[PDB]
Amino acid sequence: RKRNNPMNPFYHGTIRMFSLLILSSSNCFRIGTIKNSSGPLG
Amino acid sequence: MQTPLEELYNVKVERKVSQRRLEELGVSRWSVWKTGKCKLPWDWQVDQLVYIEEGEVRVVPEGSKRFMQFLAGDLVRYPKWLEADLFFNAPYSERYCFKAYADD
Amino acid sequence: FVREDYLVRKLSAQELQDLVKGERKVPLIVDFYATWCGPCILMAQELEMLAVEYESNAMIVKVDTDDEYEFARDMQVRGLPTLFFISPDPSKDAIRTEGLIPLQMMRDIIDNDM
Amino acid sequence: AKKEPYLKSGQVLIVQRDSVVIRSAKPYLATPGAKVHGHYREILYEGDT
Amino acid sequence: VDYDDGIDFPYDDPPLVCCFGAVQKEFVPVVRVHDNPMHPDIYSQWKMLQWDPPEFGRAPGGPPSNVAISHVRLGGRAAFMGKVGGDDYGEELVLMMNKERVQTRGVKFDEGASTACTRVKIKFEDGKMKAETVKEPPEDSLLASELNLAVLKEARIFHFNSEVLTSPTMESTLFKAIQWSKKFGGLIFFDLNLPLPLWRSRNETRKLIKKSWDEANIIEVSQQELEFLLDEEYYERRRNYTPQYFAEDFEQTKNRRDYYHYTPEEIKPLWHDDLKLLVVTDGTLRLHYYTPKFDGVVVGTEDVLITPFTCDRTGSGDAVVAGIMRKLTTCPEMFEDQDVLERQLRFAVAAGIISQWTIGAVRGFPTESATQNLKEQVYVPSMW
């Protein structure tokens, strides 16, 4: 515990779990009325 | 990080506390804990209100690389289960009130 | 019990400044080198031979340009290998030699110019 | 397509308006009677059978 | 300026080239800071920095005499223009150039000067030891009256380095010699080879080299020199960039060495009207070429690990420049045909590759036969 203790402030990749794998650019790559608009309806 | 340590660790700070709240809490009838330049490793397995009138304390939670700066005249409520590290660089004296569930 | 394999000592810019400032009885030969420079190996061997030849009649030191690059640039070093022959007399002027000069050329400079 | 570069081996990971992102994969041909060493989705390090 | 010199002659083949500057033994000029030093005393470990070199020292160049010797060994005719002292070392240097069949009729002797020796005075400005030149060496003390106008008339390519820009006498003599060479129809080859002082700051070096840069028809710079002259931090950041989520193409997934080809828009600040060919060399691995009409890159290679105990990169850039001049003097179509340009630059690539296999710059300069053999061995027959 913290009491039994016998410093001084005054002085890429994406995780794939199911076991962990890292997905990054080393293994993933890219190949290739008023006007109606997307938004809230209330 | 972006969020200050007080919000992350849920520490109530009432800096420059007025006399009304102090007399409502009955701080004047609490005991006095004194210390000089020391370092107390403590885990708050219970809530504790602390009023600092003389001295300064820098609080470092377990593992944190930052500290919460508390001066004199501030009312601080250390939450339950907090594992911090108390640091003092000067003579220090405070009034306390350990609080159980509910109560105040 | 075991003699050291190398007689040429490596000095810092500050140590070389102190050595030049202080009283000197024998000529001081300053070598500027880098371990990544190919010609500096042959110059290192030649200067070891020269240090063997001049036991106490000359002082051979070396400065690494990867540690004292600004100091080397201040001393008007345009490339490697570069040697500075500093005479014990402060009135005289030092000699800078550029390239893999022969050992006999070093001997001539030390004997007839320092 | 005739006017498109050939696709690389792998699985389609992201589908977008005019592009796809492929997680590269290497196929291994196996005749009947071969024995696959590992369950599905099992992590294999380099050199593992 | 006013008239011509000597007697007009048809002139023999191959066309003569002139190398202007100092004749020195070894003495690589390009010096920077490297973060991977070996043992300060045990020079037997220093060969490990020859097969894992600093990037600025991948294919180091040297004095113009190295280029002249390499050019002669590659089958060309070269003449050296400079001054040596009348002592033993100057005669030794002239003998070295003579045994290599380099024309020394342009070499001027100075009986009162010590070859490769400079007089300096040591001072202690602002608490740091410094030196200042008292008497320049004879290699930096060639006067415009000491030039050889027959050589400048016959030479078809005039070659010099930026080391002469560190001496005012040599700078004035260089510009007079460039005037004479351009009068007679020769081409100006600027091989930068920035010495240690000229790496201090970009703007100072740009101002120092702008005139000679604008007086040149052919320029060869290393990748480090070009990026220092344009912007070092921008390209350093560009190399260190890594996409956060996925690569933009399959080739970006392999984490291969960066061989970025600078666009002519990026080269635009350094371009001028009389520039016929700019070559950027990433050692012998890449040869980025830029002409007013087109640009591209020649893919090369290197293997110093094939001979770990004899490899030495000193003089490789001199061999590359000598091969470039050798092919330019005999193939005028290089300036106008891109395929021919790449085919002839593969010869210089091979020449640079061989030059890294021997200890010593002069000792390891390849011959034309060996260079052509290596070129035909390395490349497929359709790239010859």
Side-chain angles (χ1 to χ4, degrees), chain E residues 32 56 199-202 223-240:
Chain E
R32 307 190 80 178
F56 60 87
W199 293 96
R200 185 193 306 267
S201 53
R202 180 186 73 258
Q223 157 185 338
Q224 294 73 33
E225 292 170 357
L226 180 76
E227 291 180 355
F228 172 79
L229 289 180
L230 297 175
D231 195 1
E232 229 174 4
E233 282 68 20
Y234 169 77
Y235 291 104
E236 219 280 350
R237 285 184 270 105
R238 183 201 48 79
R239 279 194 304 273
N240 296 337

Side-chain angles (χ1 to χ4, degrees), chain E residues 6 23 27 29 31 33 35 42 71 102 173 202 210 217 250 271 302 308 321 366:
Chain E
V23 41
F27 188 74
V31 179
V33 181
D35 62 329
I42 305 182
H71 183 79
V102 178
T173 306
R202 180 186 73 258
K210 176 172 176 55
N217 302 91
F250 178 83
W271 204 261
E302 76 179 25
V321 173

Side-chain angles (χ1 to χ4, degrees), chain B residues 13-22 50-52 70-76:
Chain B
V13 183
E14 204 164 349
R15 53 196 60 179
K16 285 179 169 56
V17 49
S18 70
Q19 182 59 224
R20 200 276 304 180
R21 218 283 171 265
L22 291 178
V50 167
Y51 184 29
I52 302 96
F70 295 154
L71 281 312
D74 302 0
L75 177 56
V76 179

Side-chain angles (χ1 to χ4, degrees), chain E residues 187-248:
Chain E
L187 296 177
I188 306 300
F189 198 131
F190 195 5
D191 179 16
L192 213 65
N193 291 14
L194 291 177
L196 205 163
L198 295 193
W199 293 96
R200 185 193 306 267
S201 53
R202 180 186 73 258
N203 298 326
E204 158 187 332
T205 307
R206 290 285 296 274
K207 303 310 165 299
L208 276 165
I209 73 173
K210 176 172 176 55
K211 188 177 167 188
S212 53
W213 186 281
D214 300 329
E215 291 298 325
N217 302 91
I218 312 138
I219 298 179
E220 190 278 322
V221 292
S222 67
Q223 157 185 338
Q224 294 73 33
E225 292 170 357
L226 180 76
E227 291 180 355
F228 172 79
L229 289 180
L230 297 175
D231 195 1
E232 229 174 4
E233 282 68 20
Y234 169 77
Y235 291 104
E236 219 280 350
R237 285 184 270 105
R238 183 201 48 79
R239 279 194 304 273
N240 296 337
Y241 172 80
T242 300
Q244 187 174 0
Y245 303 101
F246 49 86
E248 288 297 326

Side-chain angles (χ1 to χ4, degrees), chain E residues 289-303:
Chain E
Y289 58 88
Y290 306 89
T291 66
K293 279 168 51 186
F294 51 82
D295 71 314
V297 62
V298 169
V299 176
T301 182
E302 76 179 25
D303 200 6

Side-chain angles (χ1 to χ4, degrees), chain E residues 50-65:
Chain E
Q50 282 300 324
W51 62 58
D52 193 20
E55 288 301 325
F56 60 87
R58 178 164 296 273
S65 55

